């Protein structure tokens, strides 16, 4: 059973934090609440909609941090001229952006991870 | 030698174009300006960067922030994180297609030598590259 | 060994908690030992000493009148704060925009010896390149010195790649520093003018 201030759903526990930190602080903050916790992850749309009801006391047009980070440096690149290159030489080539959700329309925003957002944590045991 | 306009570096011809276009459009335009030409390609930390860096700094003018280069995210999904922070696989997604940044451009600061991925649909000037004709 | 050139030498000490208070003193010690091999003078070698965390604590500025023994004294007493974090990109922006905000000694070299014993988050290391490149455009050489394991090997590599002068030195820990002096010192001296 989910701790106080946590709403259950298909086995897990969630919680909307009105804290204002960056993706990293966000992710780490979650892990330091209940073992196994992380930023929220949306498997199906139903899950999303369920996390949406928890994020209602928030403004219209804002976004909450979700469990996805550094989405550009995980990519595989290539040049038009087909030039060769060793990925080790491309350590921080792209921006360090993470994903934020807009509960209203559940649209994911890929923004810089240095931005302060409200967030949602999750865990099941 | 290099065709009038195109500058030469280590046996190749580079050229700056003010004409702001999107990523693919600037690429096509390069593979139509010479045989075997595309958006410039940079050896991450080679003196070639300084060349193209200065290459643009001199030619580009006023206040343009970016200049496209021939490097993009090959991935076709809208983002490249295949797992959530909890280890769970990334299947379901909703990425807002306009925040999708797969196209690399040089940045003005430090004299166009700092890379950055931008929205490919953006209209920016550029640099073309191609071997000797 | 003894170095007497036209140098602007900046010691940047990784004052994080990734170093035990006792280990910090070994760091400080190394900094003081290289100073006895330096001809510290306003016309020869000028040194600044900063302890950085998420911010910068500067215990020594290039322009100073205190005697070099007085200067070596101030660095050996550099208080320990074992900060939670110790951002390398950030203390490089300090150096870029403060120490060398202006270059009053155009005839002299400018070296920042960054002694780092930790690793900063990519959210921040995403600035490492532009600050190292900015210090380059100001004729400021950066020599990263990796003290131990917890030193981001990839982040140290980032600082190097920025220029041929930017050599690095990988060390197992602070003790090894004690024996790396001669090398570092001498390497670092061969890039500065004279007379």
UniProtKB/Swiss-Prot annotation, chain A:
Biotechnology: Is a standard reagent for testing vWF/platelet interactions and detection of the defects in von Willebrand disease and in GPIb-related disorders such as Bernard-Soulier syndrome.
Keywords per UniProt: Disulfide bond, Hemostasis impairing toxin, Platelet aggregation activating toxin, Secreted, Toxin
Main location: secreted
Subcellular location field: Secreted
The protein, known as: Snaclec botrocetin subunit beta
Source taxonomy: Eukaryota, Metazoa, Chordata, Craniata, Vertebrata
Disulfide bonds: 2-13, 30-121, 98-113
Primary role: Snaclec that binds to von Willebrand factor (VWF) and induces its interaction with GPIbalpha (GP1BA) (via the vWF A1 domain), resulting in platelet aggregation.
Assembly description: Heterodimer of subunits alpha and beta; disulfide-linked. Botrocetin and vWF form a soluble complex.
Similarity comment: family membership: Belongs to the snaclec family.
Note: There are two distinct forms of the vWF-dependent platelet coagglutinin. The dimeric form (snaclec) is 34-fold more active than the metalloprotease botrocetin in promoting vWF binding to platelets.
Tissue spec. comment: Expressed by the venom gland.
Domain C-type lectin: 9-122
Family annotation (Gene3D superfamilies): Mannose-Binding Protein A, subunit A (3.10.100.10)
Curated annotation (Swiss-Prot), chain B:
The protein's name in its UniProt record: Snaclec botrocetin subunit alpha
InterPro entries xrefs: C-type_lectin-like, C-type_lectin-like/link_sf, C-type_lectin/snaclec_domain, C-type_lectin_CS, CTDL_fold
Family: Belongs to the snaclec family.
Disulfide bonds: 2-13, 30-128, 103-120
SMART domains referenced in this protein's UniProt entry, alphabetically: CLECT (SM00034)
Gene Ontology molecular function: toxin activity
Subunit structure, as described in the record: Heterodimer of subunits alpha and beta; disulfide-linked. Botrocetin and vWF form a soluble complex.
Application notes: Is a standard reagent for testing vWF/platelet interactions and detection of the defects in von Willebrand disease and in GPIb-related disorders such as Bernard-Soulier syndrome.
Known tissue expression: Expressed by the venom gland.
A Pfam family this chain is assigned to: Lectin_C
A Gene Ontology cellular-component term: extracellular region
Domain of life: Eukaryota
Additional detail: There are two distinct forms of the vWF-dependent platelet coagglutinin. The dimeric form (snaclec) is 34-fold more active than the metalloprotease botrocetin in promoting vWF binding to platelets.
Keyword vocabulary terms for this entry: Disulfide bond, Hemostasis impairing toxin, Platelet aggregation activating toxin, Secreted, Toxin
Subcellular location: Secreted
Family matches, as SUPFAM superfamilies: C-type lectin-like
General function of this protein: Snaclec that binds to von Willebrand factor (VWF) and induces its interaction with GPIbalpha (GP1BA) (via the vWF A1 domain), resulting in platelet aggregation.
Ranges for domain C-type lectin: 9-129
This protein's record includes keyword Disulfide bond: yes
Curated annotation (Swiss-Prot), chain C:
Top-level taxon in the UniProt lineage: Eukaryota
Protein name, per record: von Willebrand factor
Limits of the VWFA domain: 8-184
Disulfide-bond pairs as recorded: 3-189
UniProt feature coiled coil, ranges: none
């Amino acid at each position: 059973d989910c701790p106080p201030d946590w709403s259950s759903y298909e086995g897990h526990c969630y919680r909307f934090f009105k804290e204002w930190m960056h993706w990293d602080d966000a992710e780490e903050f979650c892990t330091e609440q209940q073992t196994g916790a992380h930023l929220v992850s949306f498997q199906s749309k139903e899950e999303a909609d369920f996390v949406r009801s928890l994020t209602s006391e928030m403004l219209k047009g804002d976004v909450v941090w979700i469990g996805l980070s550094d989405v550009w440096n995980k990519c595989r690149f290539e040049w038009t001229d087909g030039m060769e290159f060793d990925y080790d030489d491309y350590y921080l080539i792209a921006e360090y952006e993470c994903v934020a959700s807009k509960p209203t329309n559940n649209k994911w925003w890929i923004i810089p991870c240095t931005r302060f957002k409200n967030f949602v944590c999750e865990f099941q045991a | 030698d290099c065709p009038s306009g195109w500058s030469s570096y280590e046996g190749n011809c580079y050229k700056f174009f003010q004409q702001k276009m999107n990523w693919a459009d600037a690429e096509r335009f390069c593979s139509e300006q010479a045989k075997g030409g595309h958006l410039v390609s940079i050896k991450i930390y080679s003196k070639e960067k300084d060349f193209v860096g200065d290459l643009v700094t001199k030619n580009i003018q006023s206040s343009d922030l970016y200049a496209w280069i021939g490097l993009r995210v090959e991935n076709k999904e809208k983002q490249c994180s295949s797992e959530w922070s909890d280890g769970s696989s990334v299947s379901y997604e909703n990425v807002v297609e306009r925040t999708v940044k797969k196209c690399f451009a040089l940045e003005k600061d430090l004299g166009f030598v700092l890379w950055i991925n931008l929205y490919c649909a953006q209209k920016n000037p550029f640099v073309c590259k191609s071997p000797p004709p | 060994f003894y170095c007497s050139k036209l140098l602007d030498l900046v010691f940047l000490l990784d004052g994080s908690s990734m170093l035990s208070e006792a280990e910090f003193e070994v760091l400080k010690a190394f900094v003081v030992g290289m100073m006895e091999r330096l001809h510290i003078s306003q016309k020869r070698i000028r040194v600044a000493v900063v302890e950085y965390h998420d911010g910068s604590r500067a215990y020594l500025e290039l322009k100073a009148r205190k005697r070099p023994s007085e200067l070596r004294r101030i660095t050996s007493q550099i208080k320990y704060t074992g900060s939670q974090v110790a951002s390398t990109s950030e203390v490089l922006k300090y150096t870029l925009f403060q120490i060398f905000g202006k270059i009053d000694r155009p005839e002299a070299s400018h070296i920042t010896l960054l002694l780092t014993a930790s690793q900063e988050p990519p959210r921040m290391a995403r600035n490492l390149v532009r600050y190292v490149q900015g210090l380059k455009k100001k004729k400021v050489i950066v020599i990263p010195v990796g003290i131990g394991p917890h030193a981001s090997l990839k982040q140290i590599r980032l600082i190097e790649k920025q220029a041929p002068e930017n050599k690095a030195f990988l060390l197992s820990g602070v003790d090894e520093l004690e024996q790396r002096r001669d090398e570092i010192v001498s390497y670092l001296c061969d890039l500065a003018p004279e007379a």
